[PDB]
Amino acid sequence: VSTINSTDALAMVEHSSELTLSITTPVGTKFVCRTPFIGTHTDKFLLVEMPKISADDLQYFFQEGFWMNIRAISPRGEGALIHFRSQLMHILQEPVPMAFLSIPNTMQVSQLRKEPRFELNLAGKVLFDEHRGDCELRDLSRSGCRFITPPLGKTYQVGDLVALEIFSDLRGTKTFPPLTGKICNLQRSLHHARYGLEFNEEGRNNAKNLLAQLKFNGTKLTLN
Amino acid sequence: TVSTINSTDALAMVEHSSELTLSITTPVGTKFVCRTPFIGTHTDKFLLVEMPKISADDLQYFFQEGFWMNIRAISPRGEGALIHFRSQLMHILQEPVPMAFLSIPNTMQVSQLRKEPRFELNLAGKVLFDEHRGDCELRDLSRSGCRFITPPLGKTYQVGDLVALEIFSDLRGTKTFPPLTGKICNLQRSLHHARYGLEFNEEGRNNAKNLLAQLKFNGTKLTLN
Numbered sequence: 123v124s125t126i127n128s129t130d131a132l133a134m135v136e137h138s139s140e141l142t143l144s145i146t147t148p149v150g151t152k153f154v155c156r157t158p159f160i161g162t163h164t165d166k167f168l169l170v171e172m173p174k175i176s177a178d179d180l181q182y183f184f185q186e187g188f189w190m191n192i193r194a195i196s197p198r199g200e201g202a203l204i205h206f207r208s209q210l211m212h213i214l215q216e217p218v219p220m221a222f223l224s225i226p227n228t229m230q231v232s233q234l235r236k237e238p239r240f241e242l243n244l245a246g247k248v249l250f251d252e253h254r255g256d257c258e259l260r261d262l263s264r265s266g267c268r269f270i271t272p273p274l275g276k277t278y279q280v281g282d283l284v285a286l287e288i289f290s291d292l293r294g295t296k297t298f299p300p301l302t303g304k305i306c307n308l309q310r311s312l313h314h315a316r317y318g319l320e321f322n323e324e325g326r327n328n329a330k331n332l333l334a335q336l337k338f339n340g341t342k343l344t345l346n
Numbered sequence: 347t348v349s350t351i352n353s354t355d356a357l358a359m360v361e362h363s364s365e366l367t368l369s370i371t372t373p374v375g376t377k378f379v380c381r382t383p384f385i386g387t388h389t390d391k392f393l394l395v396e397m398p399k400i401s402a403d404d405l406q407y408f409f410q411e412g413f414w415m416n417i418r419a420i421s422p423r424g425e426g427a428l429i430h431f432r433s434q435l436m437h438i439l440q441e442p443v444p445m446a447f448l449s450i451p452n453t454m455q456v457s458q459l460r461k462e463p464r465f466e467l468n469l470a471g472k473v474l475f476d477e478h479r480g481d482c483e484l485r486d487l488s489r490s491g492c493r494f495i496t497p498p499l500g501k502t503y504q505v506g507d508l509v510a511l512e513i514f515s516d517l518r519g520t521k522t523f524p525p526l527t528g529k530i531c532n533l534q535r536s537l538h539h540a541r542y543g544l545e546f547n548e549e550g551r552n553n554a555k556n557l558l559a560q561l562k563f564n565g566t567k568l569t570l571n
């Protein structure tokens with residue numbers, strides 16, 4: 123792991139992303155919860171939304187002065203795991219429930235992935251048994267990828283073997299050879315279902331060729 | 347190119363802590379323009395911003411709950427984008443720290459910001475201006491210009507100044523690429539460094555084309571081979 127200044131570290135974290143708060147009371151009792159990162163006020167405070175927890179834990183584990191270990195994630199490229207200690211300084215209910223946490227001078231950062239994931243937005247179809255539904259590739263690596271599907275579309279579970287046919291252009295006809303792999307992770311949202319995939323040998327060869335046709339436009343990878 | 351986008355997706359494009367431009371039109375018709383840092387958003391309820399660093403007068407006068415304003419935000423990656431929308435100052439807090447809560451409309455306008463993409467990188471180098479030579483680091487590059495940073499205590503430049511950047515072609519700094527020459531177009535000092543935007547002259551464009559051709563994209567940004 124590496125130690126870097128808090129301004130630079132937090133700059134790697136997208137606002138609204140999820141933070142993992144591990145709180146340790148004065149007696150030693152631990153408590154972990156998740157909550158959205160709002161942002162920072164100057165160099166004085168780290169702002170987060172009040173955790174979606176019980177009103178009992180909320181006032182027995184979430185009190186001013188209590189310390190906690192916070193984990194944040196930087197999604198781009200090889201990604202990064204960010205860890206640091208912070209003290210709960212202030213709690214407000216109005217105009218909206220939120221917490222002000224202290225910002226240490228430095229934070230620890232560690233590599234999250236073996237290789238980088240490249241962002242993109244490529245429409246395609248996902249194959250699974252008799253199903254063939256719409257999907258969009260959101261990121262691609264040499265070993266895997268991320269794709270999303272409609273909330274009402276067929277769902278997959280970790281371990282399922284699927285294949286993605288990515289359109290080579292807007293015609294919605296011709297596609298790159300199948301990207302085959304197993305679902306490794308998933309996360310349902312209100313606007314779509316997300317899946318992480320790890321390619322089998324054939325998938326890796328086809329991904330390699332697809333990456334070879336993509337160009338970086340300063341923001342993400344794009345097709346011709 | 348102009349399009350309408352839902353606020354959640356549009357604000358996801360804006361980096362937290364970045365400067366917002368607020369154009370306020372009081373209920374009289376009086377207009378005021380100030381800038382202030384974007385903090386973030388709470389759920390899909392409020393847009394949080396730090397209090398503008400303006401005089402108390404203009405403050406209690408142009409910055410009051412209920413007042414409306416047109417906000418301009420920036421999406422900095424690549425060709426970037428200009429995000430424009432209308433918002434109402436809903437709440438003003440003083441404790442524990444001064445901050446304002448603005449309303450978030452359902453949709454926002456997204457329009458073109460740049461004529462071409464800017465590619466991020468981190469290349470150490472030297473900045474030359476008149477008889478001075480100082481350390482700098484190239485932060486982004488495009489066919490027509492670049493962005494570079496310098497130490498807080500180093501020699502400063504003003505818009506219009508013609509400078510030259512000698513970027514090292516290797517980690518050890520055993521040599522430099524042909525110079526990136528052009529005029530300063532914008533600047534901004536921050537806690538850890540001074541930042542400048544530059545627009546190349548002919549020579550600059552030629553050498554920038556040469557430099558870009560030697561860089562690879564590692565998924566996060568361009569780097570030396």
Ligand SMILES: Nc1nc2c(ncn2[C@@H]2O[C@@H]3COP(=O)(O)O[C@H]4[C@@H](O)[C@H](n5cnc6c(=O)[nH]c(N)nc65)O[C@@H]4COP(=O)(O)O[C@H]3[C@H]2O)c(=O)[nH]1
Binds near residue numbers: 240261267306320
């Ligand atoms: N391009 C792409 N590839 C994917 C995706 N999901 C899975 N893979 C591929 O599958 C491998 C194992 O993923 P995992 O089981 O989730 O196991 C993961 C996961 O537990 C953790 N990890 C990596 N990135 C993240 C992240 O952004 N968030 C979290 N919470 N964990 C991560 O590290 C482990 C190894 O990650 P990798 O070295 O990248 O190795 C990854 C990657 O090659 C995806 O969305 N996009």
Ligand SMILES: Nc1nc2c(ncn2[C@@H]2O[C@@H]3COP(=O)(O)O[C@H]4[C@@H](O)[C@H](n5cnc6c(=O)[nH]c(N)nc65)O[C@@H]4COP(=O)(O)O[C@H]3[C@H]2O)c(=O)[nH]1
Binds near residue numbers: 422486532542
């Ligand atoms: N690579 C790079 N090139 C730079 C930089 N600063 C200036 N240039 C070059 O100089 C041209 C004019 O910059 P400008 O006078 O600030 O005039 C700018 C500016 O007024 C506005 N603009 C562009 N990007 C941003 C931004 O990130 N923030 C803000 N506030 N305005 C921007 O649009 C105008 C035209 O922008 P461009 O089409 O890109 O054309 C830019 C670009 O080719 C830089 O930091 N990096």
